[PDB]
């Protein structure tokens, strides 16, 4: 029953990106800014918390084990409650009498739910945001453009049959005519966007109805293009991300963590370190990180916090220092008295 | 700046009830837009002061062909004089008093 | 079923350039800079991903086989699906409930699409950015009223890293075979004219059973102009696994 | 569809000057203090001129008809050939000679890599013939008057059929002022296959 503060840094082995829905102005994919347009982007604590929660879920299912066919004993509702925190059958209510003092026993039986909470059960774990140390350390990655294979390498013409060559050349011509006409359309559309940028109040809503109609029309023009509804040779939107090697100060804290809960969290970090991926763009190997946390506790009443140890996640391995963290992992593994079903 | 539909309907019907060339002087160009849109293309063809449109072109055009001239604050005084110095509008319609917006 | 991480280096026998429209400015063909205007240029993972995706495509079609006429059985739609991950035919269904488990079945029958994803289907393979180790490893080339392009220099060591997520034996076999074939023409980026792109890379394939505290190196794959050495019997096992499997319905979806 | 890698050395016995078109400095392979290199642009220009002179001397589908555009290619069509840079092997081997110029010392040993992408027999034979005609006038760069173009080269042709783990070394080309020296039955087969070409253009 101690509060463990993992204070430390995330070094970015491959670019770190996240598509926060609010953050991404339709202008382009922007990393979630730490207040206003010009602040320092941060990696959300939400994405890290979700990654670590799925890692803990995998730890729990692997520790419970699987049947001979390889099926977890749990059911769909139990999985969704464990990792997503969402109750399928609706058996989750907040401030409901009678579940009071069922929190202690439930947490003892379900260290995962104790850590990450559920709807109405406060999660002991708080996974802070990743804040870069230095200036810069963020920029636009990805970009590029999907291309037609056959203008890139002519050899693939020799695999395709003549009828398929005809199909590919009708595909080129129809994509290119759709391109030019969608283009002139967008050109008048942005001249109208300038008109809107110099239109009045409550007169622009009719021009906006017009714009939504243009949009519908565009999507219909798209529809009635047979198979290749989508432009093939299309540029790929850049995604903002933290540069490789970016140092991101991170503060995570487990509030009033039993040795079992801390052990489960640490094991969740051991399992996460197998694939240290955060965020998205895993196609571009984005998300890979090596992270070192100094775990410090602070007994309430004491003036300074003691350092229980260090957790260094690295591609070469996971290094755990201090006997406190080993004892916590061993305590969690040894405890057979967990229940992850019912309630 | 939403114009109550009851008011817009009443103003439009009253304008439609006119029977001669008129100079409807609104305050804003948005009021001109709303009146022109809701006005169901009544006879004595209407004439609207587009935001920014110099008044000389529209006024000269209306001189030859008379009818409802829905001007706005852009009226800038002057006069909708008939070509040979004669009154070519019988009905000066002030849709609403041109109250200035609050300057907070 | 394992996660394979490939960590290692790319030695650029000749320069390496990439014309990313974002990076390139009025100055000319400039590499994306890994952040600001002054940060170390990186070779985008998109280019290497495309190159290895197309190597996988060509090995898949050749192992499917060619008819006496010299054409492949595949149609244009499936070629585009495999290579570019574009739903030509036009039944994506996104997160369709029926698809929920059919994706796994699709992964069983189409190792390439599982490895390299499509729209809606998460790709197991992640191809990262190569970044130079040292400094001043990038300069201008292309002297000829001719625009010069920026590129890495001969012998530049670029630290690259890929990752196959939850790879079956046959998916990792397909990836390794894709690398064996790509080694025939180890060319990345553009300026294939001027020969820029040809590289000599090597990767340490290390797996990490989730829960274990240290990963175990399954061996090494080095690609050199004199051949490709695959040390570690496990990689050979995954390669023969992919080769000998006759149960990949690449036509289907 | 065979892919030819031409890996080999250039021995230079005289100063190789380039960039005739503040001081006359060789093109810089990164930074300011790094090693210099010979620009592939000049080699590609010379080989283009060689192919043009050969074809005029002799006289998708578009690539098939005319090997010349196949090797080098216009803006539209992609060029099969790729001409690498020439990097010095050892330390120094370049000095300030001569608006004095900078060039590789006599005896400099220079690593050079070339390729033909997915080459077919016909235009591969045209490329090899173009190399064969290079021992007559092995000129790189300007300074024609100063005769600063005398080069010698040895080139190990190595194909690699995609799928195999190793390449097979087809043969060797030596271009010396004494002449052209060629090995490998397959390479002579390619050359014999270019003699009866029916491309014209």
UniProtKB/TrEMBL annotation, chain B:
It comes from the Bacteria. Belongs to the helicase family. DinG subfamily. This is DNA 5'-3' helicase. It comes from Klebsiella pneumoniae. The chain holds residues 417 to 520 of 624 of the full protein.
TrEMBL record, chain D:
The keyword Coiled coil applies. Keywords: Coiled coil. This is CRISPR type AFERR-associated protein Csf2. It comes from Klebsiella pneumoniae. The lineage of its organism: Bacteria, Pseudomonadati, Pseudomonadota, Gammaproteobacteria, Enterobacterales.
């Amino acid at each position: 029953m101690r509060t463990l503060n993992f204070n430390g840094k995330i070094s970015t082995l491959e670019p770190l990106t996240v598509t926060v829905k609010n953050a991404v102005s339709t202008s382009g994919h922007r990393l979630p800014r730490n207040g206003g347009f010009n602040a320092a982007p941060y990696f959300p604590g939400t994405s890290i918390r979700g990654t670590l929660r799925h890692a803990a879920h995998k730890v729990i299912v692997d520790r419970v084990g699987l049947n001979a066919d390889g099926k977890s004993p749990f059911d769909l509702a139990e999985h969704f409650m464990l990792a997503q925190g969402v109750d399928i059958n609706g058996e989750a209510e907040t401030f409901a009498p009678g579940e009071i003092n069922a929190g202690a026993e439930l947490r003892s039986k379900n260290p995962l739910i104790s850590l990450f909470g559920r709807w109405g059960l406060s999660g002991k774990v708080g996974i802070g945001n990743a804040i870069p140390d230095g200036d810069n350390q963020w920029g636009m990655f990805g970009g590029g453009a999907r291309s037609i294979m056959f203008q890139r390498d002519e050899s693939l013409m020799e695999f395709l049959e003549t009828d398929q060559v005809d199909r590919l050349e009708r595909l080129l011509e129809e994509q290119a005519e759709a391109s030019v006409d969608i283009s002139q359309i967008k050109t008048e559309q942005d001249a109208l966007k300038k008109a809107m940028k110099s239109a009045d109040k409550d007169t622009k809503a009719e021009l906006q109805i017009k714009v939504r109609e243009l949009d519908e029309k565009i999507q219909a023009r798209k529809d009635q293009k047979q198979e290749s509804r989508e432009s093939i040779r299309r540029p790929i939107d850049p995604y903002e991300a933290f540069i490789t090697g970016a140092e991101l100060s991170h503060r995570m804290s487990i509030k009033n963590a039993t040795d079992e809960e801390a052990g489960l969290f640490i094991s969740a970090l051991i399992r996460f370190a197998a694939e240290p991926r955060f965020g998205g763009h895993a196609n571009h190997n984005c998300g890979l990180v090596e992270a070192h946390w100094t775990v410090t506790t602070w007994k309430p009443g004491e003036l300074v916090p003691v350092t229980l140890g260090e957790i260094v996640i690295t591609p070469n391995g996971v290094e755990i220092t201090g006997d406190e963290l080993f004892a916590m992992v061993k305590a969690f593994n040894e405890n057979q008295s967990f229940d992850f079903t019912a309630r | 700046q939403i114009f109550s539909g009851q008011w817009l309907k009443a103003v439009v019907e009253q304008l439609s009830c006119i029977q001669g060339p008129a100079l409807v002087l609104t305050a804003s160009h948005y009021e001109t837009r709303m009146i022109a849109n809701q006005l169901g293309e009544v006879s004595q063809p209407v004439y609207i002061q587009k935001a920014g449109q110099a008044l000389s072109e529209i006024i000269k055009q209306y001189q030859e062909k008379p009818g409802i001239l829905i001007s706005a604050g852009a009226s800038v005084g002057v006069s909708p004089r008939g070509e040979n110095g004669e009154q070519i509008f019988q009905d000066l319609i002030i849709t609403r008093i041109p109250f200035l917006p609050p300057d907070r």
